[PDB]
Amino acid sequence: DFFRDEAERIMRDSPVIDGHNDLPWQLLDMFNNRLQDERANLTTLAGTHTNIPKLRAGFVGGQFWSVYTPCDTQNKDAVRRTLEQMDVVHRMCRMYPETFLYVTSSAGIRQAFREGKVASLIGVEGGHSIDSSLGVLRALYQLGMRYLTLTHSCNTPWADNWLVDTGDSEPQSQGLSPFGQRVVKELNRLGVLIDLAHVSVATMKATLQLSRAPVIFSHSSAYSVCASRRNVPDDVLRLVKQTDSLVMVNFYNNYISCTNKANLSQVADHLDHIKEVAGARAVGFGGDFDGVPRVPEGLEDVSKYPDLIAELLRRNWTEAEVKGALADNLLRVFEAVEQASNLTQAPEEEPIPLDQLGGSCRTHYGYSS
Amino acid sequence: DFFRDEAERIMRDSPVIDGHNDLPWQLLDMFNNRLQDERANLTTLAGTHTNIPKLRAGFVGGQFWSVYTPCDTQNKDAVRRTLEQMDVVHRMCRMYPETFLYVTSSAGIRQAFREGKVASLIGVEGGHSIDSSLGVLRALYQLGMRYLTLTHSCNTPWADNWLVDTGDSEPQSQGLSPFGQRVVKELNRLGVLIDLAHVSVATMKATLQLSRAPVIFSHSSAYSVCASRRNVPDDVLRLVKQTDSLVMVNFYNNYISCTNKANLSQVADHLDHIKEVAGARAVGFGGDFDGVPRVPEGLEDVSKYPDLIAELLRRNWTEAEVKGALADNLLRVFEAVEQASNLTQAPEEEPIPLDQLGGSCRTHYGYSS
Ligand SMILES: *[C@@H]1O[C@H](CO)[C@@H](O)[C@H](O)[C@H]1NC(C)=O
Numbered sequence: 138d139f140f141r142d143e144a145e146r147i148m149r150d151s152p153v154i155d156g157h158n159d160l161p162w163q164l165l166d167m168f169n170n171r172l173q174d175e176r177a178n179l180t181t182l183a184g185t186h187t188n189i190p191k192l193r194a195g196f197v198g199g200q201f202w203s204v205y206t207p208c209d210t211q212n213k214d215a216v217r218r219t220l221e222q223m224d225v226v227h228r229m230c231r232m233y234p235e236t237f238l239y240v241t242s243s244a245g246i247r248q249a250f251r252e253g254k255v256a257s258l259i260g261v262e263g264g265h266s267i268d269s270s271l272g273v274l275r276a277l278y279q280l281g282m283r284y285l286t287l288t289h290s291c292n293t294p295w296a297d298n299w300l301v302d303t304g305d306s307e308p309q310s311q312g313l314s315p316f317g318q319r320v321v322k323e324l325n326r327l328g329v330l331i332d333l334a335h336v337s338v339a340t341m342k343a344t345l346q347l348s349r350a351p352v353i354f355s356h357s358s359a360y361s362v363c364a365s366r367r368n369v370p371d372d373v374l375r376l377v378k379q380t381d382s383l384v385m386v387n388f389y390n391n392y393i394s395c396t397n398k399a400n401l402s403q404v405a406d407h408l409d410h411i412k413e414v415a416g417a418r419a420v421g422f423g424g425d426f427d428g429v430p431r432v433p434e435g436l437e438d439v440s441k442y443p444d445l446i447a448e449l450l451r452r453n454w455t456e457a458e459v460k461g462a463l464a465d466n467l468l469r470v471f472e473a474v475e476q477a478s479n480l481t482q483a484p485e486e487e488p489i490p491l492d493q494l495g496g497s498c499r500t501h502y503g504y505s506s
Numbered sequence: 507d508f509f510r511d512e513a514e515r516i517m518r519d520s521p522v523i524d525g526h527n528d529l530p531w532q533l534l535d536m537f538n539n540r541l542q543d544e545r546a547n548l549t550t551l552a553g554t555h556t557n558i559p560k561l562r563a564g565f566v567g568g569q570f571w572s573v574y575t576p577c578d579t580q581n582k583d584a585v586r587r588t589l590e591q592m593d594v595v596h597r598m599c600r601m602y603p604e605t606f607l608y609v610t611s612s613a614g615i616r617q618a619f620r621e622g623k624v625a626s627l628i629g630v631e632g633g634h635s636i637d638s639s640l641g642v643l644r645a646l647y648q649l650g651m652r653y654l655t656l657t658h659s660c661n662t663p664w665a666d667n668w669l670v671d672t673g674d675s676e677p678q679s680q681g682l683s684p685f686g687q688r689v690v691k692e693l694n695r696l697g698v699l700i701d702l703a704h705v706s707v708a709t710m711k712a713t714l715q716l717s718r719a720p721v722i723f724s725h726s727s728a729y730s731v732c733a734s735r736r737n738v739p740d741d742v743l744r745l746v747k748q749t750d751s752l753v754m755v756n757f758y759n760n761y762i763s764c765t766n767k768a769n770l771s772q773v774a775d776h777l778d779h780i781k782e783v784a785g786a787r788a789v790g791f792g793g794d795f796d797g798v799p800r801v802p803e804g805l806e807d808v809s810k811y812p813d814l815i816a817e818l819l820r821r822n823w824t825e826a827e828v829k830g831a832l833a834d835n836l837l838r839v840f841e842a843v844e845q846a847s848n849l850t851q852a853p854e855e856e857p858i859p860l861d862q863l864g865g866s867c868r869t870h871y872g873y874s875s
Pocket residue numbers: 178179180181232
């Protein structure tokens with residue numbers, strides 16, 4: 138088709154940078170992170186939405202690999218598992234160097250594009266990965282973390298998750314607690330993209346007001362099209378336009394069609410809506426591949442991106458608009474996050490009040506007066 | 507004084523590289539790692555064995571800063587606190603760049619020497635810091651860990667501590683378990699110095715036979731002089747000689763004189779013994795300043811090293827011998843550990859058997875149990 142051909146033509150110049158793929162999670166679940174297991178070979182990997190040949194077929198040039206540890210690891214082994222997940226991403230890049238180029242900056246993604254490699258970054262899904270520690274935060278930064286999803290589907294002691302909006306969770310921090318605000322201040326200082334997927338509206342609003350840099354939704358869709366609280370409402374979409382932020386669209390069926398069944402066209406509806414309310418520069422891709430049980434007809438795996446782009450061209454999106462959705466909006470936001478960082482500025486060191494630390498799996502050294 | 511002048515002349519060419527200083531622990535216990543606190547100013551800090559002017563007076567040119575988290579943090583928040591202690595060391599070097607040069611190699615130490623800065627490295631004290639994970643181990647390496655003390659004063663699921671030799675602990679792994687052997691192999695491939703301070707004799711001997719590179723005792727003294735199980739016995743000293751390893755002398759009174767009261771002359775007695783049994787290239791310093799309640803008369807703080815060097819010269823240690831004790835032996839061992847590392851060798855990924863993990867602060871993802 139003419140649109141598919143144009144899609145590929147454009148994608149050769151502007152490869153897609155996806156904001157959220159949970160392949161690392163599958164590697165842990167399926168092989169206990171044993172990359173040498175021949176069943177785990179990435180050139181032939183089956184049973185997942187992602188593998189090397191599929192990535193190449195979908196013209197994927199950049200990928201924020203999700204370093205995710207479940208909510209039940211909070212106040213348990215969340216920090217240990219986050220390190221192991223970041224480790225599996227590091228090893229993956231070193232194991233398939235002909236394919237992946239591990240990067241931690243916007244300039245780095247651009248170099249990957251020049252080299253014909255899949256720029257590979259790390260996105261930490263859930264603030265429970267830092268265990269309310271500014272020191273652990275900086276450590277994750279040093280290890281490659283380039284975005285932090287403030288919460289997953291559970292509250293941290295300083296940020297509220299989306300389930301607060303469905304009543305399944307209590308509004309603990311009413312957005313961001315004072316420590317949570319220092320976390321935003323710290324993420325801003327370091328140059329880490331703040332990610333609002335999985336958080337509550339109050340947390341979305343608090344962050345869009347508080348952050349000194351544009352923020353992202355690594356894998357969130359349009360609430361107007363599908364009223365899932367994992368999706369973004371119009372008033373927030375307006376804040377996204379105001380701050381020049383970015384919503385990277387999630388392909389999960391139940392967030393797209395609000396039911397188990399969904400198709401490629403319905404994803405373009407979310408894209409259209411985000412483009413109309415938040416603006417064309419606020420649109421991106423955050424498929425949630427390998428993180429969801431259901432993906433749309435036409436978007437069975439990571440090789441289907443050109444078909445989604447072809448559809449956007451069919452709906453009259455201009456080349457500039459699809460190039461922005463593909464990679465340029467993410468790059469603009471990433472560069473702004475880097476410009477707004479201040480590594481010379483003294484790091485945030487005021488800890489979270491002891492009465493706010495939860496669980497029965499810690500000790501209280503340092504805390505006294 | 508002839509020997510004090512000579513000590514300084516020699517120390518200006520070969521400043522001391524101490525193998526273990528617990529200042530980070532003091533920064534946590536005293537200020538909860540708040541380096542901006544006015545009391546925490548390192549140029550004026552009182553109440554500790556270490557601070558900037560003291561380090562300069564003692565001619566200290568290299569230091570392995572201990573990143574230590576208590577034994578009771580094992581199976582609790584050990585990993586979290588380890589990252590926080592590593593973080594305070596990183597921040598310390600950043601806050602006083604005119605004094606500390608953060609380094610992670612032997613060439614880096616020589617660079618610090620050339621610039622007149624105190625080479626600042628990280629020594630992780632206790633295998634519980636990795637919570638039996640090879641991924642956390644690699645993460646710590648990436649964060650700057652250049653030596654791992656296999657155990658502190660408690661057994662890990664894969665190594666036995668020194669208390670086993672006093673009867674207070676059971677010989678769980680009877681040295682190193684199979685996973686513990688894999689840890690040692692990973693430490694060798696990474697280029698991390700294996701530290702035998704705090705381990706049982708069975709662990710020292712198992713590691714000495716297994717390691718493919720020379721090892722160290724970052725802060726342990728001579729068992730013949732003081733029969734403390736925190737000290738190294740002669741048969742292990744013969745293994746140290748055989749492997750061209752290194753024993754860095756601890757200044758703690760109770761490990762020196764085997765009693766609360768001790769003096770500089772007695773520490774020199776330990777150095778003499780190690781030199782006799784393990785050889786001159788197996789001696790160094792690992793004072794344990796800021797990690798102990800009692801230090802010898804004449805060795806009150808970190809500014810006292812020149813007096814100890816003067817005593818060794820007085821005792822007829824040659825210039826080559828003291829330069830070895832000061833810096834050259836550690837540098838030799840470091841270079842060997844670096845040469846034994848292999849970047850191309852596939853990382854160890856066979857996890858510890860699930861049934862060997864303890865505590866109630868973890869989840870069993872990857873295994874399923
Ligand atoms: C993956 O498999 C291909 C062939 O199926 C092989 O050529 C390649 O060496 C393998 N890669 C790894 C890392 O095992």
